[PDB]
Structure formats: structure tokens, C-alpha cells
Amino acid sequence: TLSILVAHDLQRVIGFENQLPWHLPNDLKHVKKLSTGHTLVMGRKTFESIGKPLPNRRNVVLTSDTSFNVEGVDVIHSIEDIYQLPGHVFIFGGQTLFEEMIDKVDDMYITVIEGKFRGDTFFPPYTFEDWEVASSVEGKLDEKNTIPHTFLHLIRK
Ligand SMILES: NC(=O)C1=CN([C@@H]2O[C@H](COP(=O)(O)OP(=O)(O)OC[C@H]3O[C@@H](n4cnc5c(N)ncnc54)[C@H](OP(=O)(O)O)[C@@H]3O)[C@@H](O)[C@H]2O)C=CC1
Ligand SMILES: COc1cc(-c2c(C)cccc2C)cc([C@H](C)C#Cc2c(C)nc(N)nc2N)c1
């Protein structure tokens, strides 16, 4: 399987100044559970906004930088290399990678953040005419998770 994994708001904002605009522990747990034991593919900027690979899964970074070498990170230099990675692969961000991959993935795991944030990076537009709703699960609000959010699993029709 080739999947997208993304959290976006009502206007498809995914980022602001190389950070996420929201803090939602429930969504981070969601990411952890889906991707532990599998593969994350991300653009260079997304990786550098964290600077350390996520434990207990393969972290793949796409960059043109032939000098890129980070301990615990595998590097690729072409979109075409993504198709050679084994197992379940998750396109993890950012805007550029989403734009390049949205037409290619089998399915999408989307956390819809039910708010409107200031952003400078966006998930590309998509229509539910192209995607079946495999599941739609309301996130639980509480002390530490105070923005309404819905976990969607979308599969290409
Ligand atoms: N809300 C969410 O779920 C998520 C949000 N984000 C956010 O997204 C933002 C970053 O997005 P964006 O600026 O688009 O950056 P990206 O993370 O997509 O990185 C862009 C870089 O990736 C590399 N790259 C992309 N395509 C190719 C290619 N075909 N060949 C070689 N290298 C390639 C290039 O690296 P190089 O220049 O080194 O060659 C390029 O400059 C941040 O704000 C981050 O917070 C990210 C993931 C998820
Ligand atoms: C090391 O590469 C990364 C690690 C993390 C990271 C996570 C997910 C949890 C705890 C700590 C860290 C550092 C995040 C990212 C990017 C910003 C992303 C993302 C994302 C999120 C947050 N939610 C949904 N649904 N999809 C997503 N792609 C990259």
C-alpha cells in the first residue's frame, strides 16, 4: 500500500513557518499507531522542522542534496524511488510531496482539524467524488485536545 498521512484544517492548511499550527496529542497518537513498524516518506523541509527520525519505523527523506546524511534516516533523490520501498509506505509531508503524490496513492488517512488557522502551506484540493469514505471517526475532546477533529480514511474510487 501507498498511503497519505496528513492533518489539515477546514481550508487545508497543514503548516505555518515550518511548524504545525495546532497541538493535538490525539493526532500524534494516531500517527504513531498507524506508522509504527512501517515507512514514512517526507520532504527535506518537513524532516528538518523536526531534525530527528521517529523511533520504531523507517524514516525516508526525499532531497536533491547528495550530501544529506542523517543517522537513522534513509535518503532518496527521486519520486521514482518511492515505488521501490517495500511494505506499507506513508507519504508524510509536506505540501510539495503531497502535491506530487496525491494522484498516485491508494488511500489517505486525513485528520480534519475543524478550525481555521493562519497557514503558509496547504494540502492540495481533492473531491469526495474521487474518494470513498472507508471510515470517519470523531476525535475526543478533553483537557489536552481542545480542537474538534475527525479521522478520515479515504480510498480512491
Ligand atoms: N499538517 C500536516 O499533516 C503536515 C504538515 N507539514 C508541514 O509542511 C511544511 C513543509 O512543506 P514544504 O515547504 O512543501 O516542504 P517539503 O517537506 O515537502 O519539502 C520540500 C523539499 O523536499 C524535497 N523534494 C520534494 N520533491 C522532490 C523531488 N521530486 N526530488 C528531489 N527532492 C524533492 C526538496 O528538498 P531539497 O530542497 O533539499 O532538494 C524540497 O525542497 C511545514 O510547515 C510542515 O509543518 C508536513 C507534514 C505534515
Ligand atoms: C520526523 O518526522 C516527523 C515527525 C513528526 C512527529 C510526530 C508525528 C509525532 C511526535 C513527534 C514528531 C516529531 C511529525 C512530522 C510532520 C511535521 C508531520 C505530521 C503529521 C501529523 C502531525 N499528523 C498527521 N495526521 N499526519 C502527519 N503527516 C514529521
Distance CA 102, CA 53 (A): 23
* Residues with a CB atom less than 6 Å from ligand 1: 6-7, 14-15, 18-20, 42-46, 49, 62-65, 77-79, 92-97, 100, 121
Task: Report the residue among 12, 45, 50 best suited for mutation to probe ligand 2: largest number of ligand atoms under 8 A from its CB.
Answer: 50
The domain locations on the chain are 1-157
Distance 60 CA to ligand 2 centre (A): 13
β-sheet bridge partners, residue 58 = 39
Helix (H) or strand (E) holding 14: strand 13-15
What is the CATH code for 1-157? 3.40.430.10
Spatial distance between the Cα atoms of 140 and 66, rounded to a whole number of angstroms: 43
Structural determination approach? X-ray
| Sequence-ordered alpha helix ranges (H) in the chain | 25-35, 44-48, 95-101
For ligand 2, atom 26, the nearest C-alpha belongs to 6
Cα–Cα distance, 39 to 123 (Å, whole number)? 20
Structure resolution in Å? 2.1
